[PDB]
Design a protein around this ligand. Structure first.
Ligand code: NA
Lengths: 245, 50
């Protein structure tokens, strides 16, 4: 009754029989922008069911040596479905998200993933190693799209900050002996009421193994991690031609 | 005193500045109201005569 769950939005339904409750980021559900917080004057478009629905975007393989990955929002979805089209045809965008990370193994496998959402996840570089070069991360690294990107130095989250404190952010753990998914609801987080879905990623999703995957030889060795997410309360404004960058 | 009609009905000497406009309080920028589509003849706000 805390372990079983069904999430239905749009024409999509997710089920899980080994859940660990649901986290509502910063204790606040997503909502549409009020007339007093808004500034842009055109009437927005709110497509509803055709964009607020679950999209399964990618699968990674968890290996005994995996470092961890990240995805950026709304970047992961800007080229997918009717949501993508709207994000491309409109200058302004805003929405919340329901994130459902999936990973099942067996009662004989073990390991624990930390699944967290970090708003304004700015990536740093190793500065030429010596720390004397002011190098910058390239586009494919700051906005990896649906493929996500692998962390080079998980301990400092590729940004000079301790992953040990990442739990100060909305998160759940997928500890194999306990659950097989993480569900996080994130409201729209920004210092502006609407923004560009292309130029700005409001938050990053981090999936990092903290207790490494293990099992005895002979047990299924391919343990996938699949990412499914749904935009909530999407609004778009400032219509013109479609743009991808 | 003035006996001829034209002197009586005269506006010579009117010292009141007749103003066509007046100031209104305006501490903030004007708000925007909801609007919908209008497909109508006769009414035409876009057309002007500079
Ligand atoms: Na007019």
């Amino acid at each position: 009754s805390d372990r079983v769950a069904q999430l239905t939005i749009g024409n999509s339904t997710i089920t899980t029989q080994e859940a660990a409750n649901i986290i509502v980021g910063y204790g606040e559900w997503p909502s549409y922008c009020s007339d007093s917080d808004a500034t842009a004057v055109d009437k927005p478009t709110r497509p509803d069911v055709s964009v607020n629905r679950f999209y399964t975007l990618d699968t990674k393989l968890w290996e005994k040596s995996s470092k961890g990955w990240y995805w950026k929002f709304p970047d992961v979805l800007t080229e997918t479905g009717v949501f993508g089209q709207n994000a491309q045809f409109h200058y302004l965008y805003r929405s919340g998200f329901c994130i459902h990370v999936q990973c099942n193994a067996s009662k004989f496998h073990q390991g624990a993933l930390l699944v967290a959402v970090l708003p304004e996840y700015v990536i740093g570089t190793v500065a030429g190693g010596t720390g004397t070069e002011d190098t910058h991360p390239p586009y494919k690294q700051t906005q990896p799209g649906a493929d996500g990107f692998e962390l080079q130095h998980p301990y400092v989250l590729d940004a000079g900050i301790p992953i040990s404190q990442l739990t100060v952010c909305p998160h759940q753990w997928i500890n194999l002996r306990t659950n097989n998914c993480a569900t996080i609801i994130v409201p729209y987080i920004n210092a502006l009421p609407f923004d560009s879905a292309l130029n700005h990623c409001n938050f990053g999703l981090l999936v990092v193994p903290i207790s490494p995957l293990d099992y005895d030889q002979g047990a299924t060795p391919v343990i996938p991690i699949t990412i499914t997410l749904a935009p909530m309360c999407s609004e778009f404004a400032g219509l013109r031609q479609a743009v991808t960058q | 005193g003035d006996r001829v009609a034209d002197v009586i009905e005269s506006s010579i000497g009117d010292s009141v500045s007749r103003a066509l406009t007046h100031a209104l309080p305006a501490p903030t920028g004007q708000n925007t109201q909801v609007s919908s589509h209008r497909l109508d003849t006769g009414k035409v706000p876009a057309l002007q005569a500079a």
